[PDB]
Design a protein around this ligand. Structure first.
Ligand SMILES: *[C@@H](CN)C(=O)N1CCN(c2ncnc3c(F)c(-c4c(C)ccc5[nH]ncc45)c(Cl)cc23)CC1
Ligand SMILES: *[C@H](CN)C(=O)N1CCN(c2ncnc3c(F)c(-c4c(C)ccc5[nH]ncc45)c(Cl)cc23)CC1
Ligand SMILES: Nc1nc2c(ncn2[C@@H]2O[C@H](COP(=O)(O)OP(=O)(O)O)[C@@H](O)[C@H]2O)c(=O)[nH]1
Ligand SMILES: Nc1nc2c(ncn2[C@@H]2O[C@H](COP(=O)(O)OP(=O)(O)O)[C@@H](O)[C@H]2O)c(=O)[nH]1
Ligand SMILES: [Ca+2]
Ligand SMILES: [Ca+2]
Ligand SMILES: [Ca+2]
Ligand SMILES: [Ca+2]
Ligand SMILES: [Ca+2]
Ligand SMILES: [Ca+2]
Lengths: 166, 167
């Protein structure tokens, strides 16, 4: 059983750092922001094995038919913001709207991810994120790509959501 | 000719005040933020008469398939920001991208409108908006719905843009 996971979020929230931690078990500082690539990983979650095809999104603020079609192939999405970046949290609503748009307003598997939780420079309250995740009906996971806090949990939780949805 | 004009922009930038000034020649200190309505007006621009149907957009930050097809009926778009609201200027990119998406075109008739020019507490430099409009290939008009400065010119300029695009 193979699932296409897509990691989305504003520039600089930690999409690549989170993915590379998951796949390669190290923290990359300031990874090339133009590289969009897909990673493969076999996992066991709740005793059951799944193969993940994980798209680490990168590119410009723009839309197109082919990008719509490509994102439509995603089966679950990590909505990543950074806890020290209010704009990236406000953007989450836009990411969800565009994902639902291209997937016919399906109840798409999604996990809200609050990254950079190691930092003391918080601007988004945990309560705000929990309330937002509650409104959307999705889990919220606090992560740090730097310390690896929550990294496996974020991706594993998204797989749990895909399984529930299937 | 009959042209559908659509007024877009962030909450509070003056979309309704601009439209009501154009149509009814007065300034509203406050107007219900949920009312989205269309207004008609016959005008003569550059010696030629046109019938304008002006959609004053209001509502929530959400997409719907019917919303896409409604916006698709627009033939030209006013991108309104407020010159004392940096965030409303930063949002202009998003509005333009959504218009291009539903029109499936990069050459949609548009005018960039910097409203509330009467205020002294500017936070968006005029050159920054001029440079943005240049990169978009569209006109930039400074307006005040309060004093009526630029109001006719914003809508008339959009009609000129539509005319240039249809021919
Ligand atoms: C930093 C400036 N470079 C910045 O904030 N962003 C934000 C958006 N970014 C982004 N990169 C790659 N891919 C996408 C993307 F596919 C979409 C998207 C979605 C989620 C659904 C449907 C879409 N149709 N076209 C694009 C679509 C979005 Cl919203 C943003 C993407 C990084 C740059
Ligand atoms: C208020 C709270 N901060 C606020 O800023 N907004 C943002 C703008 N909003 C809005 N209201 C009504 N209609 C739209 C709208 F049609 C679109 C839009 C555009 C510009 C192009 C294509 C579209 N397809 N579906 C919707 C489309 C946008 Cl982007 C915003 C709209 C709500 C309140
Ligand atoms: N302190 C801290 N920095 C992070 C974290 N995740 C990513 N970064 C850093 O934030 C910046 C942006 O990360 P990046 O992975 O490139 O974000 P992306 O643009 O969403 O792919 C980099 O300098 C990263 O080193 C984190 O969890 N904690
Ligand atoms: N000083 C000043 N205030 C304006 C102007 N245009 C709109 N407003 C005010 O800004 C607020 C929002 O106007 P409104 O038309 O309701 O914004 P909308 O949400 O974009 O439709 C109102 O209090 C208006 O009176 C302007 O040109 N100058
Ligand atoms: Ca990246
Ligand atoms: Ca749910
Ligand atoms: Ca027409
Ligand atoms: Ca209004
Ligand atoms: Ca909806
Ligand atoms: Ca042009």
């Amino acid at each position: 059983t193979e699932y296409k996971l897509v990691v989305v979020g504003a520039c600089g929230v930690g999409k690549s750092a989170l993915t590379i931690q998951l796949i390669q078990n190290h923290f990359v500082d300031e990874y090339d922001p133009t590289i969009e690539d897909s990673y493969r990983k076999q996992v066991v979650i709740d005793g059951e094995t799944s193969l993940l095809d994980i798209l680490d999104t990168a590119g410009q603020e723009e839309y197109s038919a082919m990008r719509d079609q490509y994102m439509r192939t995603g089966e679950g999405f990590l909505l990543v913001f950074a806890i020290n970046n209010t704009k990236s949290f406000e953007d989450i609503h836009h990411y969800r709207e565009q994902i639902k748009r291209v997937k016919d307003s399906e109840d798409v598997p999604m996990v809200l991810v609050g990254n950079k939780s190691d930092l003391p420079s918080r601007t988004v309250d945990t309560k705000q994120a929990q309330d937002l995740a509650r409104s959307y009906g999705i889990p919220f996971i606090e992560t740090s790509a730097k310390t690896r806090q929550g990294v496996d949990d974020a991706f594993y939780t998204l797989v749990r959501e895909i399984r529930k949805h299937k």
